[PDB]
Amino acid sequence: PINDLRSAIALLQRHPGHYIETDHPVDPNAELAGVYRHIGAGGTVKRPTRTGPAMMFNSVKGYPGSRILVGMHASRERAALLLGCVPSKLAQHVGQAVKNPVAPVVVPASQAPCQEQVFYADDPDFDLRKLLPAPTNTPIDAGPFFCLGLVLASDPEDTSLTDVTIHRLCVQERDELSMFLAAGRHIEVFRKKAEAAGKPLPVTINMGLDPAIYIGACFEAPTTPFGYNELGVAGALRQQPVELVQGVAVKEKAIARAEIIIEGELLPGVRVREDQHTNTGHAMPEFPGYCGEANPSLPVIKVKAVTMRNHAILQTLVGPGEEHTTLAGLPTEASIRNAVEEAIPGFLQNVYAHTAGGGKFLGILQVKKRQPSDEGRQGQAALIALATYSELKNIILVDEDVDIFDSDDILWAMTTRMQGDVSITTLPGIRGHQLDPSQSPDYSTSIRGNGISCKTIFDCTVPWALKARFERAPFMEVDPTPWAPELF
Amino acid sequence: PINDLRSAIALLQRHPGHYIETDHPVDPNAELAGVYRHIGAGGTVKRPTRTGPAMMFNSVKGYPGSRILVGMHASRERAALLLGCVPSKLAQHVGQAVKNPVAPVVVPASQAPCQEQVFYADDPDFDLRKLLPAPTNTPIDAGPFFCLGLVLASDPEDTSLTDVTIHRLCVQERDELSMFLAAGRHIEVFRKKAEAAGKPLPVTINMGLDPAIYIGACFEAPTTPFGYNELGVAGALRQQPVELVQGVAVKEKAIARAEIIIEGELLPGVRVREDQHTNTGHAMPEFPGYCGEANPSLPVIKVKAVTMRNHAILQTLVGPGEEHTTLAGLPTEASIRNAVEEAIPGFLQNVYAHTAGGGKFLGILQVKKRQPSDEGRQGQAALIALATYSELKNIILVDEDVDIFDSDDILWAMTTRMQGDVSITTLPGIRGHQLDPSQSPDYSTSIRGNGISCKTIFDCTVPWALKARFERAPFMEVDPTPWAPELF
Ligand SMILES: Cc1cc2c3c(c1C)C(C)(C)CC=[N+]3c1c([nH]c(=O)[nH]c1=O)N2C[C@H](O)[C@H](O)[C@H](O)COP(=O)(O)O
Ligand SMILES: Cc1cc2c3c(c1C)C(C)(C)CC=[N+]3c1c([nH]c(=O)[nH]c1=O)N2C[C@H](O)[C@H](O)[C@H](O)COP(=O)(O)O
Ligand SMILES: [Mn+2]
Ligand SMILES: [Mn+2]
Ligand code: NA
Ligand code: NA
User: Domain 3-octaprenyl-4-hydroxybenzoate carboxy-lyase-like Rift-related, which positions (chains A, B) (predicted)?
Assistant: First the structure.
């Protein structure tokens, strides 16, 4: 029974290979990320890299008694273990979750392990920078970062509407963090209403959570539109309302079973340059694998209190690599699968928000042509995917005999089941995503501005009429165990 | 020092994970290939499959005392070990060997372990089908097959011109094998000449060899033109001439340290249907991953003698999967690397004949743009690759910060470093390869006949002017070993 991060870790230890610890000292500045890069960062991280175990650094240089956990979500198999299904059915398992959310439930403070220790910021010696080791990913980061900070805010005019979102948080002062919100972010709608009335917006930052909470929170419109508490997707994954606690210093709720809580308020009118103390010009690595630039004008969170468990674990990520692939990719897959299943029932077999696209840019669709009229529906599925998730860039379509989670098998379909002048459709001038550096007028004359792209559909499905000629060579079905028992 | 198969096996046993044995009885008909499909076939083989150890089946049902080895070359890492270099530098290492061949030498029978046993076919009790297990790959194969039969033959007008090639051989009678020779093959030139004179062509079939010999043999023109004895490549790989021996019954040389040798003659005028005894309509699986159709008219080899070591190993393959990727792909890489380095010195960093194309259809070229004039040379390198290896189909160009052996990283370059209406060039109507089933007029109206293709170049290199914007997020250089010694 997984209710929080420690129970999640306990399960990983019953599956050797998914969790390791180290007592060898590590510097949270750059060096920690440098080590996990080789061990389990994965995703779009510059090679050498791999997926591996979730990793707990127990001796943090300069922070005795702290312990930093990274890579908890940095594997599709591990995410499947933590959620209780097989990795090939996460798209369907998460898909059914978002469409049957279970609302969270408030709990008294005596049942909130997060509040076992309280450090009020009005203490003269309080210093967030000495209190928690916020690691940096690269030596050219804007500063120390919290990268798995699940921020919880609400509409200041309608308390009933609450939104939770992961945002990168840069420690800027002893009691201040900057926070980046992209255009049209759902919490930004709350802050702008607060700022326009000259009022601060109370928020809580919740770190070190049940993996179910982080994963369920990363949906986007139109799948989870404005007004959809993303809490409850977690409630559907656990068949259990996540538990909330009333904040010890702000008029806002915090997740009771979290490891560390930061209570604060978004301040009206205030803006800071994200790299003001570093002047590196960069924020931190983005999910496509490149360095994001330092945001010149960010809102500020004024910390009112920090609240944490005894021997609190600081959970964050590195890369963001495969951890981002899982958090962003499984909502992506669930959204596409739900949409195609509504429009063409029974046709789509599976979908993979490929890690090469960070879980957002590259969609692999596995279809099954069952009848002559299914020819021509593979392109329709690609259109539905592009319509459902506008930040997609490319679609690869394959049949049910291609393993869409094996990139060699994907390239195989692109080699023997495609003709370049037949199977490739380009859609110029469609808005995509700012963080793809090839989406620039400097890359293509058909691109009118940053974050606009040509989008490409690679149809690697066998034409219906030719399917009898493209059967993969069949081998006798045997049980190989007796000839190699140790290999299982 | 490796000079035959068993010295190669001895090396693999010093690197655990690369060689296993089993004494559990196995049926060479279909069952053996079915087991190794799950264990080490890899490549384009129908999932589930993987690369693993080379595997020796010590108990062969119906052939007591026989033992069959498969998968010797079914791993790029295994191949680099057997050749004595790092897998990333195989293209350079094999490339230099083909440019500096070492000619084979003749030795007396006393130094030819292949001739420890001699079985003459004119014995009334001789039966090729009882003497050696010839495993099949699928239940629908044309018949028993030898899939690592390195055929050695010479020109009937000039016996100094020797060629050596792997051809698939189906056991048809107690003393006959059918042999498929594609059009334009070098040994086929010798065969057509002998048949035009109404005379047989003496051949030796050499099975169970130094991996350097099998790999070195799989070159094609123009890299190894007609007249180039490919045994010189193996000689350069070992810095030791391959040793030849006079056959016992045919006027042709045999590989002295081979495990099994079939001496025979290609009969003039005789033709046979490959599946005459099974009528399956199929031959065996082909490297693109589909089942080939039976050939209705093949020349036959009249077996004159079989010649073996004591406790001889019969070496063959399954899939052909990753074993074919290694055997065809390493010369493909070497051929391309030599051509590009001659034309554009210093530009090409590496090349991968991707396993998704069986080592023939898909070429990944890794280039490094060093100066503004290198812009536009990435497409030139693709043209050189296409001109050097006409059976290539598609080329993917990437920069030196992309791991060309990581298919995830390849798809990443295809996602963030590619614009569909900019980076994709199609070349319709270029002769490709018959065994790509999409190279058919039924797949594309620009294809005039079977084995003609559209060939496509995916330029996923960063445009020179934009290189400062496409730097991958830099993580601090650390030695990760002290934080997880067990995983290094
Ligand atoms: C998973 C994930 C999502 C990040 C993200 C990160 C991760 C790991 C970081 C921490 C590594 C770096 C940047 N993050 C930001 C981000 N969106 C944003 O506006 N600012 C961000 O700083 N996102 C994307 C955002 O969280 C998702 O798109 C949500 O679905 C948006 O939810 P919403 O529609 O309710 O606003
Ligand atoms: C590695 C390999 C190459 C095969 C091959 C196989 C393998 C494993 C088999 C055993 C799995 C089944 C088919 N094979 C044949 C073949 N060429 C051919 O003409 N007939 C064949 O049957 N080839 C290709 C041939 O070996 C290469 O193209 C040589 O480079 C041709 O050399 P050449 O120019 O000297 O004739
Ligand atoms: Mn939302
Ligand atoms: Mn030749
Ligand atoms: Na949200
Ligand atoms: Na040859």
Answer: 107-319
